[PDB]
Short mmCIF file of all heavy atoms in Angstrom, two decimals:
data_model
loop_
_atom_site.label_atom_id
_atom_site.label_comp_id
_atom_site.label_asym_id
_atom_site.label_seq_id
_atom_site.Cartn_x
_atom_site.Cartn_y
_atom_site.Cartn_z
N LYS A 1 0.79 -1.26 -0.06
CA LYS A 1 0.03 0.07 -0.08
C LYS A 1 0.88 1.28 0.01
O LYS A 1 0.36 2.44 -0.31
CB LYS A 1 -1.11 0.00 1.16
CG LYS A 1 -0.53 0.10 2.62
CD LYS A 1 -1.63 0.06 3.60
CE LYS A 1 -1.99 -1.33 3.94
NZ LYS A 1 -3.08 -1.41 5.02
N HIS A 2 2.11 1.22 0.28
CA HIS A 2 3.06 2.46 0.63
C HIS A 2 3.82 2.80 -0.53
O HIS A 2 4.77 3.59 -0.38
CB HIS A 2 3.88 2.08 1.90
CG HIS A 2 3.13 1.44 2.94
ND1 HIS A 2 2.15 2.12 3.51
CD2 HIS A 2 3.09 0.25 3.50
CE1 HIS A 2 1.52 1.33 4.43
NE2 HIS A 2 2.15 0.18 4.47
N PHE A 3 3.60 2.35 -1.71
CA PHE A 3 4.25 2.70 -2.97
C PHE A 3 3.59 4.20 -3.48
O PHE A 3 2.57 4.28 -3.62
CB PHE A 3 4.10 1.67 -4.13
CG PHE A 3 5.17 1.72 -4.99
CD1 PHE A 3 6.47 1.22 -4.68
CD2 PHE A 3 5.07 2.05 -6.46
CE1 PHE A 3 7.46 1.10 -5.65
CE2 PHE A 3 6.08 1.97 -7.33
CZ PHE A 3 7.37 1.58 -6.90
N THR A 4 4.50 5.15 -3.54
CA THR A 4 4.14 6.41 -4.08
C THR A 4 5.05 6.93 -5.12
O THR A 4 5.55 7.94 -5.32
CB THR A 4 4.09 7.46 -2.91
OG1 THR A 4 5.49 7.53 -2.28
CG2 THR A 4 3.09 7.13 -1.82
N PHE A 5 5.08 5.91 -6.12
CA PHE A 5 5.63 6.15 -7.51
C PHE A 5 4.68 5.67 -8.52
O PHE A 5 3.97 4.66 -8.12
CB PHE A 5 6.96 5.57 -7.82
CG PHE A 5 8.04 5.93 -6.88
CD1 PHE A 5 8.48 5.09 -5.84
CD2 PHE A 5 8.43 7.37 -6.92
CE1 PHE A 5 9.50 5.62 -4.99
CE2 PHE A 5 9.53 7.80 -6.08
CZ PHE A 5 10.02 6.89 -5.12
N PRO A 6 4.55 6.19 -9.70
CA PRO A 6 3.55 5.54 -10.63
C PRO A 6 3.92 4.15 -10.94
O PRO A 6 5.13 3.78 -10.82
CB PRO A 6 3.92 6.46 -11.97
CG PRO A 6 4.16 7.85 -11.30
CD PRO A 6 5.01 7.59 -10.10
N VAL A 7 2.91 3.34 -11.11
CA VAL A 7 3.10 2.03 -11.58
C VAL A 7 2.10 1.93 -12.93
O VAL A 7 1.08 2.59 -12.87
CB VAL A 7 2.57 0.94 -10.77
CG1 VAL A 7 2.72 -0.51 -11.27
CG2 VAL A 7 3.43 0.98 -9.40
N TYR A 8 2.76 1.50 -14.02
CA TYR A 8 1.97 1.30 -15.18
C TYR A 8 1.85 -0.14 -15.37
O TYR A 8 2.76 -0.81 -15.09
CB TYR A 8 2.72 2.01 -16.41
CG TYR A 8 2.55 3.57 -16.35
CD1 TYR A 8 3.41 4.27 -15.46
CD2 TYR A 8 1.69 4.23 -17.08
CE1 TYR A 8 3.16 5.60 -15.38
CE2 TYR A 8 1.49 5.52 -17.03
CZ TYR A 8 2.22 6.27 -16.13
OH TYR A 8 2.09 7.63 -16.13
N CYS A 9 0.57 -0.57 -15.78
CA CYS A 9 0.27 -1.95 -15.95
C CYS A 9 -0.92 -1.95 -16.62
O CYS A 9 -1.43 -0.94 -16.91
CB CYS A 9 0.19 -2.65 -14.47
SG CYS A 9 -0.87 -1.86 -13.20
N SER A 10 -1.42 -3.21 -16.89
CA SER A 10 -2.84 -3.45 -17.50
C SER A 10 -3.92 -3.10 -16.57
O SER A 10 -3.58 -3.04 -15.31
CB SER A 10 -3.03 -4.87 -17.93
OG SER A 10 -2.87 -5.63 -16.63
N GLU A 11 -5.27 -2.83 -16.95
CA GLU A 11 -6.38 -2.79 -16.12
C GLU A 11 -6.40 -3.92 -15.07
O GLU A 11 -6.62 -3.70 -13.85
CB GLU A 11 -7.61 -2.55 -17.07
CG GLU A 11 -8.84 -2.35 -16.12
CD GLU A 11 -10.22 -2.06 -16.99
OE1 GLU A 11 -10.16 -2.53 -18.18
OE2 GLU A 11 -11.21 -1.67 -16.47
N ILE A 12 -6.30 -5.02 -15.66
CA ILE A 12 -6.51 -6.28 -14.89
C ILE A 12 -5.45 -6.32 -13.79
O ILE A 12 -5.69 -6.69 -12.58
CB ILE A 12 -6.66 -7.50 -15.69
CG1 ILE A 12 -7.97 -7.50 -16.52
CG2 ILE A 12 -6.55 -8.85 -14.86
CD1 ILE A 12 -8.12 -8.49 -17.54
N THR A 13 -4.12 -6.10 -14.08
CA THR A 13 -3.08 -5.99 -13.11
C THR A 13 -3.31 -4.91 -12.08
O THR A 13 -2.95 -5.14 -10.87
CB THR A 13 -1.89 -5.88 -13.81
OG1 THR A 13 -1.44 -7.04 -14.54
CG2 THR A 13 -0.65 -5.58 -12.79
N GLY A 14 -3.98 -3.82 -12.49
CA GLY A 14 -4.36 -2.77 -11.67
C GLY A 14 -5.36 -3.09 -10.61
O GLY A 14 -5.14 -2.75 -9.41
N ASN A 15 -6.41 -3.73 -11.09
CA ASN A 15 -7.47 -4.35 -10.13
C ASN A 15 -6.92 -5.09 -8.87
O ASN A 15 -7.28 -5.17 -7.91
CB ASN A 15 -8.56 -5.09 -10.96
CG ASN A 15 -9.28 -4.37 -11.90
OD1 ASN A 15 -9.26 -3.11 -11.93
ND2 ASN A 15 -9.99 -5.03 -12.82
N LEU A 16 -5.82 -5.92 -9.55
CA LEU A 16 -5.18 -6.89 -8.45
C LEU A 16 -4.34 -6.02 -7.46
O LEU A 16 -4.14 -6.43 -6.33
CB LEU A 16 -4.35 -8.00 -9.20
CG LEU A 16 -5.17 -9.05 -9.85
CD1 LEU A 16 -4.51 -9.86 -11.05
CD2 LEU A 16 -5.71 -10.04 -9.02
N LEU A 17 -3.62 -4.94 -8.07
CA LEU A 17 -2.79 -4.19 -7.15
C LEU A 17 -3.76 -3.39 -6.05
O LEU A 17 -3.52 -3.48 -5.12
CB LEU A 17 -2.05 -3.19 -7.95
CG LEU A 17 -0.96 -3.69 -8.90
CD1 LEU A 17 -0.17 -2.54 -9.51
CD2 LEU A 17 0.10 -4.43 -8.05
N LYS A 18 -4.86 -2.76 -6.55
CA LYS A 18 -5.77 -2.06 -5.74
C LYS A 18 -6.38 -3.12 -4.55
O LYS A 18 -6.47 -2.77 -3.47
CB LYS A 18 -6.92 -1.44 -6.32
CG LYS A 18 -8.07 -0.80 -5.49
CD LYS A 18 -9.13 -0.23 -6.40
CE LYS A 18 -10.30 -0.01 -5.51
NZ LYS A 18 -11.51 0.44 -6.46
N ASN A 19 -6.89 -4.21 -5.07
CA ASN A 19 -7.73 -5.14 -4.14
C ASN A 19 -6.95 -6.12 -3.38
O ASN A 19 -7.37 -6.62 -2.33
CB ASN A 19 -8.85 -5.75 -5.01
CG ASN A 19 -9.90 -4.73 -5.42
OD1 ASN A 19 -10.52 -4.09 -4.53
ND2 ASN A 19 -10.09 -4.55 -6.71
N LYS A 20 -5.80 -6.61 -3.87
CA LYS A 20 -4.99 -7.82 -3.23
C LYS A 20 -3.84 -7.25 -2.46
O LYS A 20 -3.44 -7.95 -1.49
CB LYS A 20 -4.66 -8.67 -4.22
CG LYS A 20 -5.79 -9.52 -4.95
CD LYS A 20 -6.80 -10.20 -4.04
CE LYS A 20 -5.98 -11.36 -3.21
NZ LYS A 20 -7.00 -12.23 -2.57
N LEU A 21 -3.09 -6.19 -2.88
CA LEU A 21 -2.02 -5.61 -2.18
C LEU A 21 -2.45 -4.18 -1.59
O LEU A 21 -1.70 -3.70 -0.79
CB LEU A 21 -0.81 -5.38 -3.16
CG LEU A 21 -0.39 -6.65 -3.97
CD1 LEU A 21 0.73 -6.04 -4.91
CD2 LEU A 21 0.14 -7.70 -2.90
N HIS A 22 -3.61 -3.60 -2.05
CA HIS A 22 -4.06 -2.38 -1.58
C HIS A 22 -3.27 -1.05 -2.01
O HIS A 22 -3.05 -0.27 -1.12
CB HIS A 22 -4.47 -2.43 -0.09
CG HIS A 22 -5.46 -3.44 0.29
ND1 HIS A 22 -6.68 -3.48 -0.10
CD2 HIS A 22 -5.18 -4.52 1.04
CE1 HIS A 22 -7.36 -4.50 0.26
NE2 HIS A 22 -6.49 -5.22 1.03
N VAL A 23 -2.84 -0.91 -3.20
CA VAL A 23 -2.19 0.14 -3.67
C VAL A 23 -3.23 1.29 -3.99
O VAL A 23 -4.45 0.92 -4.26
CB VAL A 23 -1.45 -0.14 -4.91
CG1 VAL A 23 -0.81 1.12 -5.63
CG2 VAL A 23 -0.40 -1.23 -4.73
N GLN A 24 -2.97 2.65 -3.82
CA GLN A 24 -3.82 3.75 -3.88
C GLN A 24 -4.14 4.19 -5.39
O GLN A 24 -3.14 4.50 -6.02
CB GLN A 24 -3.33 4.86 -3.04
CG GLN A 24 -3.10 4.50 -1.56
CD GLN A 24 -2.05 5.44 -0.80
OE1 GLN A 24 -2.31 6.60 -0.79
NE2 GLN A 24 -1.03 4.74 -0.36
N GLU A 25 -5.44 4.12 -5.72
CA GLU A 25 -5.86 4.47 -7.07
C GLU A 25 -5.14 5.43 -7.95
O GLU A 25 -4.94 5.31 -9.21
CB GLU A 25 -7.36 4.77 -7.06
CG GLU A 25 -8.09 4.74 -8.46
CD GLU A 25 -9.47 4.35 -8.47
OE1 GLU A 25 -9.75 3.19 -7.73
OE2 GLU A 25 -10.37 5.18 -8.85
N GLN A 26 -4.60 6.54 -7.26
CA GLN A 26 -3.76 7.56 -7.93
C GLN A 26 -2.44 7.01 -8.63
O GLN A 26 -2.01 7.57 -9.69
CB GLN A 26 -3.40 8.71 -6.99
CG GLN A 26 -2.43 8.30 -5.86
CD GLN A 26 -2.52 9.27 -4.75
OE1 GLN A 26 -2.43 8.84 -3.59
NE2 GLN A 26 -2.54 10.57 -5.00
N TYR A 27 -1.72 6.09 -7.98
CA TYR A 27 -0.50 5.54 -8.28
C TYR A 27 -0.47 4.40 -9.31
O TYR A 27 0.56 3.88 -9.60
CB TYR A 27 0.34 5.14 -7.15
CG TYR A 27 0.48 6.19 -6.03
CD1 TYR A 27 -0.12 6.04 -4.87
CD2 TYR A 27 1.16 7.37 -6.47
CE1 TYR A 27 0.04 7.11 -3.85
CE2 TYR A 27 1.39 8.39 -5.53
CZ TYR A 27 0.68 8.27 -4.20
OH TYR A 27 0.86 9.23 -3.23
N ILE A 28 -1.72 4.00 -9.53
CA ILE A 28 -1.87 2.84 -10.42
C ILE A 28 -2.37 3.70 -11.67
O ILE A 28 -3.39 4.25 -11.74
CB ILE A 28 -3.01 1.87 -9.95
CG1 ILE A 28 -2.60 1.42 -8.57
CG2 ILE A 28 -3.15 0.69 -10.94
CD1 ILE A 28 -3.81 0.73 -7.79
N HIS A 29 -1.51 3.57 -12.72
CA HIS A 29 -1.87 4.00 -14.13
C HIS A 29 -2.14 2.60 -14.83
O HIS A 29 -1.15 2.09 -15.30
CB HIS A 29 -0.79 4.86 -14.73
CG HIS A 29 -0.59 6.08 -14.14
ND1 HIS A 29 -1.04 7.35 -14.55
CD2 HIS A 29 0.15 6.41 -13.10
CE1 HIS A 29 -0.70 8.28 -13.76
NE2 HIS A 29 0.06 7.78 -12.83
N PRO A 30 -3.35 2.30 -15.00
CA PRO A 30 -3.72 1.27 -15.98
C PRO A 30 -3.68 1.91 -17.34
O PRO A 30 -3.89 3.07 -17.66
CB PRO A 30 -5.09 0.89 -15.63
CG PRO A 30 -5.70 2.00 -15.08
CD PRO A 30 -4.60 2.55 -14.25
N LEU A 31 -3.29 1.12 -18.50
CA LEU A 31 -3.39 1.49 -19.83
C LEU A 31 -4.07 0.36 -20.75
O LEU A 31 -4.02 -0.76 -20.36
CB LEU A 31 -1.96 1.56 -20.42
CG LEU A 31 -1.04 2.57 -19.67
CD1 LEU A 31 0.47 2.32 -19.89
CD2 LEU A 31 -1.37 3.93 -20.07
N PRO A 32 -4.89 0.69 -21.70
CA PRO A 32 -5.48 -0.15 -22.61
C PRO A 32 -4.43 -0.77 -23.44
O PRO A 32 -3.34 -0.34 -23.42
CB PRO A 32 -6.39 0.83 -23.42
CG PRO A 32 -5.58 2.04 -23.57
CD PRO A 32 -4.86 2.18 -22.38
N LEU A 33 -4.79 -2.04 -23.96
CA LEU A 33 -3.96 -2.65 -24.82
C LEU A 33 -4.04 -2.11 -26.21
O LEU A 33 -5.05 -1.51 -26.48
CB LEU A 33 -4.34 -4.22 -24.87
CG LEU A 33 -4.54 -4.96 -23.61
CD1 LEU A 33 -4.94 -6.33 -23.89
CD2 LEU A 33 -3.38 -4.89 -22.67
N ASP A 34 -3.15 -2.46 -27.08
CA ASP A 34 -3.21 -2.26 -28.54
C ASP A 34 -3.49 -0.79 -28.86
O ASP A 34 -4.21 -0.36 -29.82
CB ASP A 34 -4.33 -3.10 -29.14
CG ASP A 34 -3.98 -4.54 -28.95
OD1 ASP A 34 -2.81 -5.07 -28.90
OD2 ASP A 34 -4.93 -5.43 -28.88
N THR A 35 -2.95 0.23 -28.01
CA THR A 35 -3.16 1.60 -28.17
C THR A 35 -1.94 2.31 -27.79
O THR A 35 -1.20 2.21 -26.95
CB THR A 35 -4.17 2.03 -27.15
OG1 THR A 35 -5.45 1.26 -27.20
CG2 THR A 35 -4.51 3.51 -27.18
N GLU A 36 -1.62 3.26 -28.95
CA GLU A 36 -0.47 3.99 -28.71
C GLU A 36 -0.68 5.06 -27.80
O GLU A 36 -1.64 5.91 -27.94
CB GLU A 36 0.10 4.70 -30.19
CG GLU A 36 0.28 3.51 -31.15
CD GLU A 36 0.81 4.12 -32.45
OE1 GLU A 36 0.19 5.00 -33.09
OE2 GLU A 36 1.90 3.69 -32.92
N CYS A 37 0.14 5.08 -26.69
CA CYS A 37 -0.02 5.88 -25.44
C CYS A 37 1.28 6.62 -25.22
O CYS A 37 2.33 6.05 -25.15
CB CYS A 37 -0.21 5.01 -24.17
SG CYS A 37 -1.86 4.17 -24.16
N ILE A 38 1.27 7.82 -24.78
CA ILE A 38 2.47 8.67 -24.34
C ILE A 38 2.60 8.45 -22.86
O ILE A 38 1.76 8.70 -22.06
CB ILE A 38 2.29 10.03 -24.87
CG1 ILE A 38 1.97 10.16 -26.33
CG2 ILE A 38 3.69 10.73 -24.63
CD1 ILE A 38 2.73 9.29 -27.33
N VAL A 39 3.84 8.27 -22.39
CA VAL A 39 4.26 8.00 -20.99
C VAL A 39 5.48 8.77 -20.69
O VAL A 39 6.66 8.33 -20.78
CB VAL A 39 4.45 6.55 -20.63
CG1 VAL A 39 4.84 6.30 -19.25
CG2 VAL A 39 3.04 5.81 -20.93
N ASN A 40 5.35 9.99 -20.10
CA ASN A 40 6.45 11.00 -19.89
C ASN A 40 7.15 11.26 -21.17
O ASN A 40 8.47 11.13 -21.24
CB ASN A 40 7.45 10.42 -18.90
CG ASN A 40 6.92 10.11 -17.57
OD1 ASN A 40 5.65 10.70 -17.27
ND2 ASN A 40 7.46 9.34 -16.68
N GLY A 41 6.46 11.64 -22.24
CA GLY A 41 7.02 11.83 -23.49
C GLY A 41 7.95 10.69 -24.00
O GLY A 41 9.07 10.93 -24.46
N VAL A 42 7.45 9.47 -23.82
CA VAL A 42 7.85 8.28 -24.65
C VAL A 42 6.64 7.50 -24.98
O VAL A 42 5.74 7.24 -24.18
CB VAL A 42 8.59 7.31 -23.73
CG1 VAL A 42 9.06 6.09 -24.39
CG2 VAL A 42 9.72 8.03 -23.03
N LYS A 43 6.56 7.24 -26.31
CA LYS A 43 5.60 6.34 -26.83
C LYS A 43 5.69 4.92 -26.26
O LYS A 43 6.88 4.43 -26.30
CB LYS A 43 5.40 6.38 -28.35
CG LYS A 43 4.37 5.48 -29.09
CD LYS A 43 3.77 5.86 -30.39
CE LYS A 43 4.96 5.66 -31.40
NZ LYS A 43 4.24 5.81 -32.81
N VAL A 44 4.64 4.34 -25.64
CA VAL A 44 4.70 2.94 -25.37
C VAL A 44 3.34 2.20 -25.81
O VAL A 44 2.34 2.88 -25.81
CB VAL A 44 4.93 2.58 -23.91
CG1 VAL A 44 6.33 3.24 -23.40
CG2 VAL A 44 3.75 3.06 -22.92
N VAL A 45 3.39 0.83 -26.01
CA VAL A 45 2.35 0.11 -26.27
C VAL A 45 2.34 -1.15 -25.25
O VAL A 45 3.47 -1.70 -25.11
CB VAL A 45 2.13 -0.45 -27.63
CG1 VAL A 45 0.89 -1.19 -27.92
CG2 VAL A 45 2.16 0.87 -28.66
N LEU A 46 1.28 -1.58 -24.81
CA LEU A 46 1.02 -2.93 -24.20
C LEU A 46 0.31 -3.71 -25.17
O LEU A 46 -0.60 -3.38 -25.88
CB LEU A 46 0.07 -2.87 -23.01
CG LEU A 46 0.47 -1.65 -21.99
CD1 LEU A 46 -0.37 -1.83 -20.72
CD2 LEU A 46 1.90 -1.39 -21.78
N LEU A 47 0.80 -4.98 -25.26
CA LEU A 47 0.37 -6.07 -26.12
C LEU A 47 0.19 -7.36 -25.08
O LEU A 47 0.84 -7.51 -24.18
CB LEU A 47 1.36 -6.44 -27.19
CG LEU A 47 1.90 -5.50 -28.06
CD1 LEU A 47 2.89 -6.02 -28.97
CD2 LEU A 47 0.75 -4.95 -28.99
#
């Protein structure tokens, strides 16, 4: 619960972080799959 840096992960991984380890919704950035997304001025994709 005490992580106060961003975590990027999938939605599903995010649900598990919130509900099983209790990370705080603000620090979980879920991203959709198959979508060009900018992350601190770096393009990334999750597949």
